[PDB]
Each structure stands twice: as structure tokens, then as C-alpha cells.
Amino acid sequence: KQYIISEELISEGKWVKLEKTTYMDPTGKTRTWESVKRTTRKQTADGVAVIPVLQRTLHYECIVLVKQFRPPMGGYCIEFPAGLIDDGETPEAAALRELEEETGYKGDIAECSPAVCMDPGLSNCTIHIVTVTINGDDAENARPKPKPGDGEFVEVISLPKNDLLQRLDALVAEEHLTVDARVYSYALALKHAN
Amino acid sequence: KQYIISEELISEGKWVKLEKTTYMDPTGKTRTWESVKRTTRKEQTADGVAVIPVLQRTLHYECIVLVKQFRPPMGGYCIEFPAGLIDDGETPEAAALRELEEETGYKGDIAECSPAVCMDPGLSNCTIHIVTVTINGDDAENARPKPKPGDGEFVEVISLPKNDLLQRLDALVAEEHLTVDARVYSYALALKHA
Ligand SMILES: CN1CCN(C(=O)c2ccc(F)c(F)c2)CC1
Ligand SMILES: [Cl-]
Numbered sequence: 477k478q479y480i481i482s483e484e485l486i487s488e489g490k491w492v493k494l495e496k497t498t499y500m501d502p503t504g505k506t507r508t509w510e511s512v513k514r515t516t517r518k519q520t521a522d523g524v525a526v527i528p529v530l531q532r533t534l535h536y537e538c539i540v541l542v543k544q545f546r547p548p549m550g551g552y553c554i555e556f557p558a559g560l561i562d563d564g565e566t567p568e569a570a571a572l573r574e575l576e577e578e579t580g581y582k583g584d585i586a587e588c589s590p591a592v593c594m595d596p597g598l599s600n601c602t603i604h605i606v607t608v609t610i611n612g613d614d615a616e617n618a619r620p621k622p623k624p625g626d627g628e629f630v631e632v633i634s635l636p637k638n639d640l641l642q643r644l645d646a647l648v649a650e651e652h653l654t655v656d657a658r659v660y661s662y663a664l665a666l667k668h669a670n
Numbered sequence: 671k672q673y674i675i676s677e678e679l680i681s682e683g684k685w686v687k688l689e690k691t692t693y694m695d696p697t698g699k700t701r702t703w704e705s706v707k708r709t710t711r712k713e714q715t716a717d718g719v720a721v722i723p724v725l726q727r728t729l730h731y732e733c734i735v736l737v738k739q740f741r742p743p744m745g746g747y748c749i750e751f752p753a754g755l756i757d758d759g760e761t762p763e764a765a766a767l768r769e770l771e772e773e774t775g776y777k778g779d780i781a782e783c784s785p786a787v788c789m790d791p792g793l794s795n796c797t798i799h800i801v802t803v804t805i806n807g808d809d810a811e812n813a814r815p816k817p818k819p820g821d822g823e824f825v826e827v828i829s830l831p832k833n834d835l836l837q838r839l840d841a842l843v844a845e846e847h848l849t850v851d852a853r854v855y856s857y858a859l860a861l862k863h864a
């Protein structure tokens with residue numbers, strides 16, 4: 477029933493554009509929507525976000541997260557390792573690379589989602605969510621070497637998967653940080669699972 | 671270390687703006703960022719709510735109630751948690767219960783409400799509260815739930831068993847062009863990993 481008729485550039489930057497989208501509502505009535513897109517896609521998706529499951533024997537399984545200053549938020553956020561996928565990179569390869577860059581950990585692909593939307597009322601940004609395990613007992617992960625590209629400043633925060641939501645709520649309480657919605661949703665479902 | 675120096679408007683629409691953000695990096699170097707923000711945020715603790723709605727029904731498996739809508743930014747149909755912006759002076763809990771009723775017909779009961787979490791913090795300042803709500807599907811109020819879609823809202827309801835949520839999402843994705851939301855996919859993934 478519904479579809480795009482046309483778009484109108486409102487404003488284009490180096491990284492992001494605002495369009496005014498004209499679409500046909502299912503009654504036959506034409507309507508407008510202000511939409512954001514990145515200027516960077518070719519690709520399966522804009523980005524990958526990595527769920528990294530750090531597995532060490534005789535230890536709790538942890539989920540590895542990153543803390544970074546996010547200029548649009550004006551503050552520090554707690555997030556899954558993530559970045560944009562390069563021209564000709566697969567989502568998997570991007571995932572392993574971003575994970576190593578942001579955390580120093582070297583991991584193995586467990587599974588890879590289809591492209592999923594980030595905020596579909598506002599943008600067209602999509603990602604692949606990529607579940608990766610990290611054999612934390614392997615010598616290559618003993619003193620993990622985080623290799624940031626230019627301007628990245630990433631703190632690594634590993635939390636136990638069995639108490640993830642309580643641990644995240646504590647950090648928010650004591651630290652004035654914003655947790656990412658996908659991180660919080662995953663933590664919620666860990667508690668909700670039956 | 672890091673903080674905002676200035677926020678210069680690039681373009682302001684009726685509902686979304688684009689800003690040039692100048693900030694201080696942790697090396698003491700000034701950098702900039704293109705940031706998206708909504709124009710609708712007042713004193714609300716967040717832009718919006720998303721509802722994790724747990725439909726409970728004696729001798730049924732618990733379902734997660736989802737919605738499918740056309741999303742003009744995406745140019746297609748998306749499957750999401752029920753969600754909407756918080757009205758000025760409305761509480762997040764109130765906004766969740768109202769939005770859930772408008773989009774699905776169901777009258778829920780509040781279970782928990784997250785702090786403000788960031789939607790896509792490399793891109794925008796947008797935040798939500800994620801509100802978990804139980805729906806007593808044995809209550810006669812919830813028997814034949816009628817959506818009250820607002821002007822230009824056209825929402826289909828999709829209830830899926832919690833115990834098979836990821837496989838059922840994968841099946842819906844397999845059989846038609848539609849994108850699953852990242853927060854939904856994240857929650858379904860954690861249901862599997864638990
Ligand atoms: C009230 N009508 C006007 C048209 N419409 C929008 O243009 C819109 C509102 C907020 C957004 F963030 C956005 F991206 C788009 C909403 C429905
Ligand atoms: Cl796993």
C-alpha cells in the first residue's frame with residue numbers, strides 16, 4: 477500500500493543529509509516526512525555492532541562494551557563495539573576488525589543478523605548485529621592491544637552477562653553515562669528470559 | 671576529559687535539525703562532528719518511549735507484541751516495539767501505556783522503566799525510555815483489542831512467542847521485504863543467548 481514518491485534534499489553535510497520525503501499513505505493521501513541519511517553507504521548496511529562474549533574458564537562469561545564521548549549526545553555512552561563497514565568489507569570482517577580496533581580482542585564469528593534499523597522514524601541507518609565469542613584464555617587475548625584509528629578514544633568495560641542489566645543500571649547511577657538502547661534491550665531480555 | 675565547545679545550527683526543519691558540533695578531544699585538540707537532533711524535545715527526560723509488551727495469557731506461551739509500519743526514512747516496512755514520542759508533561763510510563771494502547775489496542779500494566787537510553791549516539795542525541803509492560807490477556811479489556819491509530823498512523827500488530835522470537839522474526843524477514851528493528855533483534859538475540 478505505502479511507498480516513496482520522491483525525496484527533497486533539505487541539507488547535505490560531509491557525513492549526514494536531511495531530506496523531506498514525500499510518500500503515499502495507504503488511503504491514497506500524499507504526506508511528508510523529514511528523514512536523515514548518512515552520506516557514506518554503497519553495502520549491506522551502514523554499520524556493524526558487535527556483541528562480544530568474553531569466555532574465560534572458571535570466570536563468569538562477560539559481555540565486552542565500550543565507553544566513548546559521543547558529540548551528538550554531549551556526553552559519554554556505553555555501547556557495543558561498532559563502526560561503519562568499509563567499501564568491499566563483509567559485515568563479519570568489519571565486526572572482527574572493529575572489535576580488535578576498539579577492544580584489542582580477537583574473536584570468532586558466531587552469527588550475523590540481517591540489516592536491522594537503528595531509528596526508523598528518523599533515519600535509514602542500519603547495521604548488522606554480529607555475535608562474536610572471544611576465547612579469553614588464548615594467548616592472543618591475554619593483554620589485548622586496542623588499535624584506535626584517528627580521533628577514536630575508547631574505554632573498554634567488560635560486564636558479567638548473568639547480571640548485565642543490574643551492572644549497567646549501577647554504572648548509570650554512579651557515573652552519569654548513557655547506555656545504548658540495543659545494549660539495554662539485550663540486557664533486559666537476558667533478565668526476561670524464562 | 672571531553673566536552674562540547676559549541677553547537678552551530680546547519681539546518682532546522684519542522685521536526686529535525688542538523689548541527690555542527692565542536693568539541694574538545696582528550697589530547698586537547700578541538701574537533702567537530704555533524705549531529706542530528708529533534709526539534710520536539712522540551713523538559714521530557716527523553717524524546718520517546720518504546721514498549722516491551724509481554725502478553726500473558728493462561729495456558730498460552732508469553733508473547734512479545736510488535737508492530738509493523740511503513741517508515742518513510744527507511745522506504746519500507748519495519749517491525750518494531752510499539753513506540754512514540756512523549757507529550758510535554760507526560761511521564762515516560764504514561765506515554766508507554768498510551769502509545770501501546772493507541773498502536774495495538776492493548777491495556778497494559780507497568781513493570782519497569784529504564785533510564786533514558788541513546789538511539790544512535792554517533793549520529794543523534796535521540797533518547798528513549800524503554801518501558802516493559804505486562805498485558806493481562808485474560809482480562810476482558812484485552813479480548814478484542816482495537817487500535818486507535820492517530821492521523822496518518824497505520825499500524826499492524828504482530829504477536830510472537832517469546833520462546834521462539836528470533837526464529838519467528840527470521841521467518842517473517844525470509845518471506846517479505848521488511849526490516850527488523852535493532853532493539854527488537856537485540857532483545858530476540860539475548861532471549862536465545864540466555
Ligand atoms: C505530525 N505529522 C507531521 C509529519 N511527520 C514528520 O515529518 C516527522 C516528525 C518527527 C520526526 F522526527 C520525523 F523524522 C518526521 C510526523 C507526522
Ligand atoms: Cl554466544
Ligand SMILES: [Mg+2]
Pocket residue numbers: 557558559578
Ligand atoms: Mg565505533
Ligand SMILES: [Mg+2]
Pocket residue numbers: 558559574577578628
Ligand atoms: Mg572502530
Ligand SMILES: [Mg+2]
Pocket residue numbers: 752753754755773
Ligand atoms: Mg509509534
Ligand SMILES: [Mg+2]
Pocket residue numbers: 753754755769772773823
Ligand atoms: Mg503513536
